[model samples]
Target: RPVLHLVALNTPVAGDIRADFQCFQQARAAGLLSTFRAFLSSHLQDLSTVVRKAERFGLPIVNLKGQVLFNNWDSIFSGDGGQFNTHIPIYSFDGRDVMTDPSWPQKVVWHGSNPHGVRLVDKYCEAWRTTDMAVTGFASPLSTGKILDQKAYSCANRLIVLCIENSF
Candidate 1:
């Protein structure tokens, strides 16, 4: 079976939850949940277990990365004690659509700062790209229609997506 790589570039800085949610919804809607073979995620609540359960259900989970900040998912997801910079999440897919896309195995990278003064950056090569690059500015979901303070805005230096190919 062909594999699809899904990467969540730069997470935990707020606003990225929206992008992560979008990927989850899109993959489920496309009836491609069963194809996931691995995961890379932060030590955030429930996310690691969610992937572990999926693996327990007979799915092939391999190449585990991330979840390094805490000991939470290290035993199950990554036995290597995880990496220091594993903040974002990465997932995989298996299907014909992913196999045929000319842009499959694209290199994606992004960097930004969040309202909490946290700097974020992530990079990965994936089999699909799904992001709206026109939106460079991010506002706190807590505020409505009000101009967020300078601290409330998350700015990105660059958002890059390039077509490439290699084994996961």
Candidate 2:
């Protein structure tokens, strides 16, 4: 089924493609077709892109934690609902099963958003490419509202990101 492959592992603050490749590699290894490219984006249309990809596999959106995210309402900053209408929300052998397992721990996952909303290209310490310890980006947990939560962290810090999908 189509789902969010939330990698429980931490990634270096390398770049969006860094985490993007993980989902690609892992999901493809799990028999899901994926493209080699940055899945995280600062553009509004990127949200719709992910859903279209999800539709390819045909699955339901389930927020196991009931975080109240992926709502139909617009974010305070992004002005849209992340192109998500199902309001439900997985990774590998390492990812916490957000829809089934109750062992899901609360961990901070990087999305490069303002916590108020995603799609901020200017943020993320220069698209998360910076190795400078002085540079920073925003991150929040996988829980609701926190989807756009803005907690600052240096780009040099190691963290995890949401593994979404898209085409080449």
Candidate 3:
């Protein structure tokens, strides 16, 4: 079974202007803009090169089966290991089979914005329904784990069901 991993955006790393703007806006509204800016500035040179490399390589490769892979750290998942729901099998690109452990090319492709999020859910369902490989796992935002509030938990649960109905 292919797992639908939920990777969250920890900070305003890099990618497109829209994503950057969104992340920045969110951080600013949440009063974390300064912190996020400091975090980025602390590694200005490193992050600059990373953004360039991501542009050159066209970060995130999503196969026909919707198996997403990205090499750039700026555009990839940055949460801790425990944040991921690893009970379900992950998709293995090498063997092209679902595995119990986190294997090679561990990546999660996410859809940004509300509309796009819905599309992502639809794609996940299609992948599962057509290929007999369902999304059985998830990952949540770093803030979510820290907060663990009712709203955050509720949203995370909702997203899981959106990917795989009755997943819980």
Best by TM-score: 2
> Candidate 1, residues 1-168: lDDT per residue as tens digits?
322233332222222333344445545655535433113222232223333332233332231232222222223224222222232223222222221233334222222222222222222111112233333432222122111112212223222211111122
Worst 10-residue lDDT window for candidate 1 reads 142-151
**Cα deviation of 2, candidate 2, in Å:** 7.5
Q: What are the per-residue Cα lDDT tens digits for candidate 2 across 1-168?
A: 343322332233343345555656765665556443333444452323443432434333333233333322222235432333223443332435543444434344556664344456655657656757777666654444344455676666655555543332
Look at candidate 1 and give me any clashing residue pairs: 4-93, 105-127
Q: In lDDT terms, how accurate is model 3?
A: 0.25
Q: What is candidate 3's lDDT per residue for 1-168, written digit by digit as tens?
A: 332221223321221123334434544553532222111111112212322332323343222244443332233323222232233333322222232232322233222212111112332222222222333212223233210111211111222110110011
Off by over 4 Å in 1: 1-15, 28-43, 52-54, 62-168
How accurate locally, in lDDT, is each candidate? 0.27, 0.45, 0.25
lDDT of 3 at 2: 30
TM-score of each: 0.27, 0.55, 0.20
| Clash pairs for candidate 2 | 61-88, 62-88, 62-89, 63-88, 63-89, 115-148, 115-149, 116-148
Question: Which candidate number would show the highest lDDT if scored against the true structure?
Answer: 2
